Amino acid sequence: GSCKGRCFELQEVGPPDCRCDNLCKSYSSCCHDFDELCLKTARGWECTKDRCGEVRNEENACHCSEDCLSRGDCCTNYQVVCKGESHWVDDDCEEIKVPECPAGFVRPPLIIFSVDGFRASYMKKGSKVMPNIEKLRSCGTHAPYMRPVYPTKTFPNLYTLATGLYPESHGIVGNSMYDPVFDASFHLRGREKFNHRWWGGQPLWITATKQGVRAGTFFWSVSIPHERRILTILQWLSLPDNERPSVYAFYSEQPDFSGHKYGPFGPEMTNPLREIDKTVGQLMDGLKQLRLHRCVNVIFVGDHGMEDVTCDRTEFLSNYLTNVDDITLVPGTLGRIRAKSIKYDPKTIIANLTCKKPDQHFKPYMKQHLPKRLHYANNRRIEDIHLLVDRRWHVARKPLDVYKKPSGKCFFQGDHGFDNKVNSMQTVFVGYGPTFKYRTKVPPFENIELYNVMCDLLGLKPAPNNGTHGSLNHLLRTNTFRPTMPDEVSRPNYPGIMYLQSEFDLGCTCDDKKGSTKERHLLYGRPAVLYRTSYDILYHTDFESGYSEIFLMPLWTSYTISKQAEVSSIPEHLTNCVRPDVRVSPGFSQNCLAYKNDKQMSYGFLFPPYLSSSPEAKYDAFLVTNMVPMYPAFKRVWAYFQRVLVKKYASERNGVNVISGPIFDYNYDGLRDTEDEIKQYVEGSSIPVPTHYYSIITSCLDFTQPADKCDGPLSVSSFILPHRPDNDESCNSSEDESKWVEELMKMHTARVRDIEHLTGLDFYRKTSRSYSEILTLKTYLHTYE
Ligand SMILES: *[C@@H]1O[C@H](CO)[C@@H](O[C@@H]2O[C@H](CO)[C@@H](O[C@@H]3O[C@H](CO)[C@@H](O)[C@H](O)[C@H]3NC(C)=O)[C@H](O)[C@H]2NC(C)=O)[C@H](O)[C@H]1NC(C)=O
Ligand SMILES: CC(C)CCC[C@@H](C)[C@H]1CC[C@H]2[C@@H]3[C@H](O)C=C4C[C@@H](O)CC[C@]4(C)[C@H]3CC[C@]12C
Ligand SMILES: [Ca+2]
Ligand code: NA
Ligand code: NA
Ligand code: NA
Ligand SMILES: [Zn+2]
């Protein structure tokens, strides 16, 4: 019943006996002598010259006696002050080609150094503010920033780091959330979060344990000082082989707490950054002390950034809604609206939150209409009504929920939780160790990708997650995972002139009654259909398409627009022209009368007639197989994209290749719908209505080369535009399309990977680039930041 000899034990001693481990204070179960035996403080944390060779005093927090190296519990600077050694930060960086671990180490240990609220821009003030972190950054592997998940809150991001899952998949969709099945609420302050029912997926410490890899307990009670946390990881690393963990975790509540108090750019932020770097210095000094500084893989990682947010910048739903007392709001940098259950109508609530104030600093969303890149909808804990708060702003229920002590006060000057594309929300990643690359800069990536890497760093088979395994191979000098292209499931048909124009009774009227193009319009090979379906390849002068016979529309439409291409007007005799495609059966073609009968639905073309190379080739653009059902409100967005924006991108990027097509996601799970999951069709027909329309715009990273003659890395920008019957999302949609369309498309920017999940297609299968390069390209997100 005492902590003698079992201080910070890794053993699973539970209720009701008193424990002595990392979270005994959190579970309120420490033994009586835990503080006096395990949390010692005497003589501080740093050795002095007078303490060198001291008589061992069991009272002391750490020891400077000659025998302390044997015990593994020296102060982290013992060798520096006593044995005349240098600080790890003062040493010149030497490349770690192979792990230099003591005998008995079966794998290079992984220390995850989580820092709460560490903005990416905090690294700009380094070298002297953060000498130890700067050495890790410049001499290891770093990205300029790492993209967190939405919401950019602590618990959703830390668990995303641990599982590689979107919060909608691993369940921690917010710091606070309500589960209608549990009829209970989750909060980071409380005991309910310790209930395992809230945590889906498989975190890293569970993936490791299930595969015979010992994990140190990742979580530390706030009562434990950081020096004691580092000392405990160092003592754990001195355990025997059969007891020593292979993966550890240090969590710093800083610089989040000071960033919340003084804002990200405050001068009071350098002392916490110096404090964290001191802890980083203590870890590296301790590792070098244990001869582990060239054996351990250290990941310096943050969960999110920090934005200037003051209470003076708050939106109040009482200024929009008639009875906010009937509403439960998750307030702050994001908004989640629930029925309080004490006349609650989400349609009326959405309408009266939509573009009501001229500079409205939030936008309401039905969660299935949120930008798909956020992947924040497929969970019963995500409320149907969501508010995207503008950066630097808050949303609250009523004006009495804000709190300010003195005149014009605001207890906090910084906050986070915004859209994870926001640059202030970007956090840091530094990988230092034998498995990481030396002095290497990697492009920014999303924290959903780290779980795969940490599993690779530990020899672990990752649980199914939302990282693209292989996209971060360029961070590692050794790759345990070699990605392979998925097999094409459905082979394409290549129909000739099978049907006469006379056998068509589709109600279509038009006033006119091979590789040669693959080379030009299909630059990276045809997409692979990764599901069972019947579809045909259709060749034309200006575009190629994979036309689905089940969906009566192309799954994709590929075409290249040169830098010097010319945008022509639709000739007036062809304004309502839809010609039948003699290569496609009448039964597998759309009916033009179905669009007449459907008074809410119109139609558009995947390849734009505006970008036809000749008035003769323009007739192919009006084929029934280039036609997709489009709401007239969406046609405003699509026509502007097709007749102005594609040309603009071709003129800026020295030509572009465009792959456009429909997306069906009626259950908003981010995956392509089956035929039975499509909940809307064109009235009186089996023509399905897409929920989105994607486009993948690829060019040459070397803009001095045209898109069709590029012999190097590609540059991609993609979007998944919501196919909505109104433009309610765009508050300036009354104006010309040059004042709201491109802004709307930037908000719905997407990774090619997002489109692949949503379409069952695999792009970029025929390039001069390695597959790991392409996977990095597929996960790229053009943020417009
Ligand atoms: C992010 O990653 C998640 C985990 O990989 C994905 O969620 C998984 O979706 C799968 C398919 O919808 C589910 O898998 C199995 O589906 C078959 C259907 O044939 C069923 O028999 C199984 O019961 C079912 N899974 C089981 C046994 O639970 C997964 O359940 C589900 N996994 C999780 C953890 O949610 C997401 O789809 C992915 N997101 C995106 C956008 O790709
Ligand atoms: C208050 C803080 C200082 C510490 C908070 C700790 C808390 C978030 C941790 C402690 C134990 C964790 C669970 C445990 O490690 C095992 C599992 C099983 C795994 O399948 C899913 C995750 C889960 C439930 C962990 C969730 C996070 C917990 C409760
Ligand atoms: Ca779906
Ligand atoms: Na040919
Ligand atoms: Na119509
Ligand atoms: Na509008
Ligand atoms: Zn946090």
Author numbering: 56 to 397, 401 to 571, 588 to 859
Sentences from the paper on this structure:
ATX is the main producer of LPA, forming the ATX–LPA signalling axis with LPA acting as a multifunctional lipid mediator by engagement with six dedicated G-protein-coupled receptors (LPA1–6). ATX regulates many pathophysiological processes [e.g. vascular development, neuropathy pain, fibrosis, rheumatoid arthritis, sclerosis and cancer].
This served as a reference structure that was used for comparison with the iSX model. Similar to the cryo-SSX dataset, preferred orientation was not observed [Figs.
